């Protein structure tokens, strides 16, 4: 990884950790608590 200023910088395509929780509709800040709420949702 060489730091040259002309390297095409691209920001991450998918917004990090948006509240797309599968059934939880509660989103924890970290990725670990994001999938933990579907476990905390229902069985």
């Amino acid at each position: 990884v060489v730091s040259d200023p002309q390297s095409m910088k691209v920001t991450p395509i998918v917004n990090p950790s948006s509240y797309v929780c599968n059934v939880c509709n509660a989103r924890f800040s970290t990725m670990s608590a994001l999938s933990e709420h579907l476990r905390s949702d229902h069985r």
């Binding site: 200023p5 002309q6 920001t11 917004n15 948006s18």
Partner: protein, 194 residues
């Protein structure tokens, strides 16, 4: 445009340019217009229905039919002030992926120009994502454009990724582009208009 109000409507397509990028004066035709071929319009709510077991979230269109996200969209600004939380989560990553193009159409608006050096690499995502963060149901912050500083020498510009450009020539108030130089090499050489 001499009062910092640009007419026309704004676009958000992903244009990974390397040469001159003039957002306020598009040298091309606008990519699509309202009601064109495969150009659907978002509904009054902007509501996004999510589909299960790994399908795409579909977005409810003008005639209350859940059309899919990837493609083209005419997104009226009053819908954007009430559903910018559904924009920035679902339909905006499909802009940066380069698979959907939204014509966020507001008839008139105040604008802002962030100039930059085209030698150095720059992505116009956080300048634009800060603009999507200050949209309330009340108002919208002015539309931020990124125009390169016109260079005097033929430079080796970085490949940049810009998103916002308007539909019509909103470059009325551009008096000159390098008023103390022999000639503009790279940028938009707009001489003093007689």
């Amino acid at each position: 445009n001499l009062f910092n109000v640009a007419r026309g409507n704004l676009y958000l397509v992903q244009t990974a340019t390397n040469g001159n990028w003039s957002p306020m004066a598009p040298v091309a035709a606008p990519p699509f217009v309202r009601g064109g071929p495969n150009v659907r319009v978002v509904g009054r709510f902007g509501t996004i229905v999510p589909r299960p077991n790994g399908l795409e979230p579909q977005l409810i269109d003008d005639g209350n039919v859940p059309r899919d996200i990837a493609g083209d969209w005419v997104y009226p600004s009053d819908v954007l002030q009430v559903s910018v939380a559904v924009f920035r989560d679902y339909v905006w990553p499909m802009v940066k992926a380069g698979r959907t193009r939204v014509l966020v159409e507001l008839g008139h608006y105040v604008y802002t120009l962030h100039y930059y050096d085209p030698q150095i690499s720059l992505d116009e995502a956080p300048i634009l994502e800060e603009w999507l963060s200050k949209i309330n149901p009340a108002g919208i912050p002015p539309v931020p454009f990124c125009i390169p500083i016109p260079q005097v020498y033929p430079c080796i510009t970085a490949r940049r990724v810009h998103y916002a450009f308007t539909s019509e020539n909103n470059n009325d108030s551009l008096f000159s582009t390098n008023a103390a130089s022999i000639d503009t090499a790279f940028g938009e050489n707009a001489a003093v208009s007689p």
